Amino acid sequence: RCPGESLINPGFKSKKPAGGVDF
Amino acid sequence: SNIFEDVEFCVMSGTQPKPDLENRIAEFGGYIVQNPGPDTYCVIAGSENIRVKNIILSNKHDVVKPAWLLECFKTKSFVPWQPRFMIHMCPSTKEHFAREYDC
Amino acid sequence: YKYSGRDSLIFLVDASKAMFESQSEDELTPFDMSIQCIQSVYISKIISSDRDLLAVVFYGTEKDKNSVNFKNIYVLQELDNPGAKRILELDQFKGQQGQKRFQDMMGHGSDYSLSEVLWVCANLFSDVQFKMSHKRIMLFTNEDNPHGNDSAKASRARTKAGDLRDTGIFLDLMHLKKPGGFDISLFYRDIISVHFEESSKLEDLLRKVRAKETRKRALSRLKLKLNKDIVISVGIYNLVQKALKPPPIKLYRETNEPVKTKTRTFNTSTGGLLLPSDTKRSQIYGSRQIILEKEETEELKRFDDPGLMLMGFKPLVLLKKHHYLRPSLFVYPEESLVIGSSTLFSALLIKCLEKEVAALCRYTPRRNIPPYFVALVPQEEELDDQKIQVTPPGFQLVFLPFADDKRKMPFTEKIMATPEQVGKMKAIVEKLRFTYRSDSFENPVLQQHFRNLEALALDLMEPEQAVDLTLPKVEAMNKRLGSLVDEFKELVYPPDY
DNA sequence: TCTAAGAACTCTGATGTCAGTAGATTACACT
DNA sequence: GTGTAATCTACTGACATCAGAGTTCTTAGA
Numbered sequence: 098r099c100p101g102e103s104l105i106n107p108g109f110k111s112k113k114p115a116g117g118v119d120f
Numbered sequence: 121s122n123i124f125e126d127v128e129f130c131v132m133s134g135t136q137p138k139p140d141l142e143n144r145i146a147e148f149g150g151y152i153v154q155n156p157g158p159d160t161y162c163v164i165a166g167s168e169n170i171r172v173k174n175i176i177l178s179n180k181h182d183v184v185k186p187a188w189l190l191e192c193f194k195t196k197s198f199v200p201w202q203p204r205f206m207i208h209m210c211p212s213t214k215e216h217f218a219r220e221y222d223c
Numbered sequence: 224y225k226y227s228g229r230d231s232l233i234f235l236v237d238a239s240k241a242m243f244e245s246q247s248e249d250e251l252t253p254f255d256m257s258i259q260c261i262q263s264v265y266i267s268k269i270i271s272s273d274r275d276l277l278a279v280v281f282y283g284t285e286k287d288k289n290s291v292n293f294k295n296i297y298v299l300q301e302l303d304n305p306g307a308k309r310i311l312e313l314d315q316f317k318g319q320q321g322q323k324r325f326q327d328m329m330g331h332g333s334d335y336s337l338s339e340v341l342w343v344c345a346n347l348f349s350d351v352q353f354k355m356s357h358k359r360i361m362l363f364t365n366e367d368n369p370h371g372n373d374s375a376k377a378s379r380a381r382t383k384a385g386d387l388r389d390t391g392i393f394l395d396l397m398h399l400k401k402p403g404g405f406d407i408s409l410f411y412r413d414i415i416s417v418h419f420e421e422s423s424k425l426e427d428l429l430r431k432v433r434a435k436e437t438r439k440r441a442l443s444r445l446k447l448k449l450n451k452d453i454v455i456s457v458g459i460y461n462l463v464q465k466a467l468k469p470p471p472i473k474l475y476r477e478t479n480e481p482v483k484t485k486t487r488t489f490n491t492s493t494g495g496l497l498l499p500s501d502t503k504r505s506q507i508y509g510s511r512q513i514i515l516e517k518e519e520t521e522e523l524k525r526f527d528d529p530g531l532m533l534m535g536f537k538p539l540v541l542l543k544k545h546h547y548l549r550p551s552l553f554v555y556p557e558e559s560l561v562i563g564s565s566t567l568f569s570a571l572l573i574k575c576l577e578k579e580v581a582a583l584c585r586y587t588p589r590r591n592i593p594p595y596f597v598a599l600v601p602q603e604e605e606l607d608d609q610k611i612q613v614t615p616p617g618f619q620l621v622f623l624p625f626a627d628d629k630r631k632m633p634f635t636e637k638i639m640a641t642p643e644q645v646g647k648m649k650a651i652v653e654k655l656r657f658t659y660r661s662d663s664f665e666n667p668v669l670q671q672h673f674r675n676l677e678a679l680a681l682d683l684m685e686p687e688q689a690v691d692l693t694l695p696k697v698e699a700m701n702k703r704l705g706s707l708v709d710e711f712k713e714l715v716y717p718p719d720y
Numbered sequence: 721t722c723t724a725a726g727a728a729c730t731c732t733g734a735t736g737t738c739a740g741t742a743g744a745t746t747a748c749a750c751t
Numbered sequence: 752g753t754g755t756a757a758t759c760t761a762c763t764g765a766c767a768t769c770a771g772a773g774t775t776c777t778t779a780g781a
Contacts, residue, residue, distance in 0.1 A: 101611050104395075104427050105267050107230055107357050110611075112432045116663030117692040120656070120703050155477065170682050226739060274764095354740095442767075443737060464767080470732080484733090589736065592769095 124150030127161050127198040129189060132175075134166035136186065141166070145189060156181055158203040164189045178204065226440060228356025231276040231302065232268075233344055234261045237364035238284040238297075240332030242399070244322055253399045254325075255317060257363035260397075260428045262313045269305050270433045270673050276355075278302040278347060279313065282340045285330030290350070292342045297329050302351045307680045314681070337369050338379035341387055341394075348392060358392040365401040368410050377410075384414050397422045433673050435466060443588055444557055447531040455564035457531070459588070459620070460553040468672050526594055527587045534583040534596070542581060542598050546629060548622035554599065555617040572616065575601040586620065596623045647710040654704055667691035 103111040128151035131142045141164070142152045156163050156175070162182035165172050175181055180202040188197055207213055236257045237243070243254045261279055268275055281297045288297045300309060316325045325331070344360055371377030387394055394414065398405045400421040407415070442461050446454040475482045488497045495501070504520040506513045515523075556565045575582065582599040599618040606612055674687040712718075 100609065104424060105264055105430065105432065106271060106436050107359070108224070108438070109436045111427075112430070112434065113662055114430070115665050115692055116660060118657050118696065120699075157477075170679075227741095437766080440766080441738065461767080467731095486733095588768095591736095 121148035123196045124148040124192060124198075127151060127196075128153050128159065130154070130156040130160055130163040131189070132156070132163050132165045132171055133169050134186070136166055136190075138166060141189060144193065148193060150189070150192070156201065158201050160201050161198050162188075162200065178202070224356035225354075226438065228354045229275050230272065230357045230359075231348065231351075231353075231355045232264075232357075232359050232361065233278040233280065233302070233347060234264075234361050235280045235282060235340065235344060235363065236261075237366060238281045238325075238329065238331060239335070239364075239366065242365045242401075243331055245402075247400075247402045251400075252322070253363075253365060254322065256399060258313055258317050258321075260363070260425070262310055262317070263431060264428050265305055265310055265313070266677070267430070267432060269307075269310070271436050273304060273306075275305075276302045276351070276353070277305045277309070280340075280344065280347075281329060282343075283333055283335030285333045286328065289343055290346050292339045292346075294339060295333050295335050296340060296343055298343070298347070302347055310681060335370070336376065336380070338376070338383045341380065341383045345387065345390070345392065360387075360392065360394040362394070362396045363399065365399040365405065367398070367401060367405045367407075371410060381413060388416075397425050433670065441557075442552065443529070444560065445529055445531050445588075446561070447533065447584070449533045454530075454561060455567055456557045456560035457568070458553075458555045458557045460555060462553050463550050465550075466666070466669060468669060521591055524593060525591050527585075529587055529590055531587075531597075532585045532594075534585055536578075537581050537583060537598070539579055539581055539600065542600070542621070542623075546624045548595075548624055548628070551622070552620045553615065553617055554620055555615070572601055572618070576603060582618075586622075596625075597621065598623060644715055647707070647714060651704060651707050651710075654707075655700075664692055667693055 101110050103109055124145065129142075129145060130153050131138065131145070134141050142150075145152060153160055158180075160181065162184045163172075163175060164184050164186065166186045172183070175183060182199050182201065184197070184199075191197075205213075234257075236254065238254075244252075246252055265277055268277060277300070278298070279300045281299055283295050284297045285295065286297065287293045287295065300312065303309070315321070341360075348355070348358055369377070369380070371380070384394065393416070396407075396411060396415050398407070398419055398421065404418065406418050408417075439460075442459045444456055444458055447457055448454050473482055473484060474480065488502070489495070490497055499517060502517070504515050504517060556568045558565055571582075581601070584597050584599055585594040586597045587594050597620045600621055601618055602614065602616050604612055604616040605614050670689065670691070674689060677683060678686045
């Protein structure tokens with residue numbers, strides 16, 4: 098179902114935006 | 121025409137009809153090449169592309185206004201080239217170019 | 224869905240002047256918005272899934288291209304695997320000059336009909352031969368009443384889109400900031416599966432996100448021989464596996480054509496194109512030469528057949544986390560063989576977690592591979608994030624070194640720090656506390672590589688040069704930490720460096 | 721006064737793997 | 752014999768992987 102599944106690339110889990118160190 | 125035979129050209133761009141540029145050249149028999157080797161006379165381009173920038177960066181070759189291969193069509197313009205290698209084995213090309221280039 | 228089915232996706236834009244040339248601002252443009260979307264999901268799909276299919280279609284244009292049901296529709300692109308020349312076809316229509324480039328060709332604002340537009344796209348998906356796992360249409364129109372002024376026009380669309388949904392093609396939507404309002408509850412309420420500015424979904428199509436995405440597939444299947452007789456089939460799956468820049472394809476300079484590397488072996492003395500049977504394999508030891516055949520350099524290194532033999536059980540504390548061999552792989556049951564063996568595996572999983580225990584196994588992934596030794600650590604799922612399964616339940620294969628692997632490391636002895644020297648450190652460490660998450664970083668090389676590759680592919684102006692996230696942001700490390708490097712420089716060592 | 725033996729990393733090429741497709745082989749069968 | 756099943760065994764795309772080969776650096780170094 099919708100909540101975790103990416104619209105660019107369906108069935109696969111949504112790629113979160115990279116992050117990195119920040120305090 | 122029988123003049124542009126023995127003279128080899130690169131029509132690296134157009135846009136004037138690019139595919140017709142080499143066709144006009146073909147009834148003048150100018151020797152069409154898709155990608156300029158160290159053999160070629162000069163390179164012809166209706167506008168810049170990144171490959172033309174590569175040939176600004178590599179001082180390689182003679183780059184020519186669009187019209188020179190629509191005005192070659194009233195002249196006979198035919199003018200050269202390069203590739204790359206620098207070499208110091210027991211260095212060899214520079215001493216060959218002491219026979220083969222002005223210093 | 225099943226493994227092989229491609230994702231397949233068709234993009235279907237409203238060419239109508241009232242949206243196409245329209246703005247309330249000057250700063251965007253709905254057609255320039257949709258075309259940007261189509262170029263940007265399409266450049267995502269090129270890096271990430273070259274196997275999955277795209278098409279793009281303009282409806283309501285004035286000059287037509289269709290198989291049938293022709294009126295006022297132009298399929299710019301039929302369904303195909305994605306690549307550069309398709310992205311160059313969309314690029315031509317972008318921008319202030321672009322909204323005139325399109326007008327010299329297909330023509331703008333004419334009457335249109337969704338029940339014909341949905342017909343056209345249907346024929347498109349039909350015409351292709353491949354197996355499709357997800358069949359999806361994307362609506363780029365703002366026209367919230369889609370000119371259903373004739374309700375007996377509109378009931379055709381709604382029935383036809385019933386027929387789309389009935390045939391298991393899906394359809395999906397984005398609203399595009401129509402001046403003053405848009406409301407799905409007027410119409411589109413029954414076409415999709417309270418009031419909006421512009422879709423919160425649409426920004427996700429501008430993530431430009433890059434990786435390979437490779438679907439769930441086994442590495443191999445094996446039999447967990449508990450002894451001489453009892454067996455269960457288990458899968459072996461690759462939860463963590465380092466990606467590589469894709470293998471480069473050698474080309475002929477003068478035409479860009481691919482070329483065959485075509486290697487042979489040739490006798491140094493003579494014309495013999497030596498066959499694989501002509502030559503053996505060998506070693507040198509003790510000033511003598513040892514000779515073996517191309518069968519037996521791989522008869523040596525055999526011990527066992529493909530399986531997993533049980534070796535007995537351990538405490539999880541004695542499996543010391545300092546010695547680690549190669550990336551851990553998952554184990555999960557497979558009823559494809561040994562039917563009902565899932566009943567045994569599940570009890571084995573459940574009860575190991577009570578015992579605080581690992582199983583030890585010997586592991587061969589293939590015929591003609593030596594056994595390694597592997598601890599099967601048991602696993603338990605954190606569904607607490609609204610059933611986003613961060614962790615699947617099963618076993619981890621964690622590999623164990625042998626004597627040869629644990630390399631000798633030089634002599635050293637010291638127990639040097641005082642409680643003040645730890646005490647100052649216990650401050651700096653607690654000032655530098657963040658939260659790592661597994662996905663919080665990206666490969667600087669492999670991300671840069673794709674941006675270089677795009678510049679070359681499209682003939683862009685520039686490599687995008689997007690700066691990496693692995694460098695420490697040293698001014699923040701100066702400020703958050705503060706001046707406390709001086710506590711080492713004063714309290715811990717002399718001023719000579 | 722320095723010249724190879726020993727590391728180290730990346731990259732390339734083959735072998736084996738899995739899933740899915742479809743052909744040809746062979747079975748089964750006629751009163 | 753003649754004809755229609757059912758079903759084994761292939762080939763391919765794709766993915767991991769050992770090995771093998773190309774490449775820069777330390778010690779021992781005339």
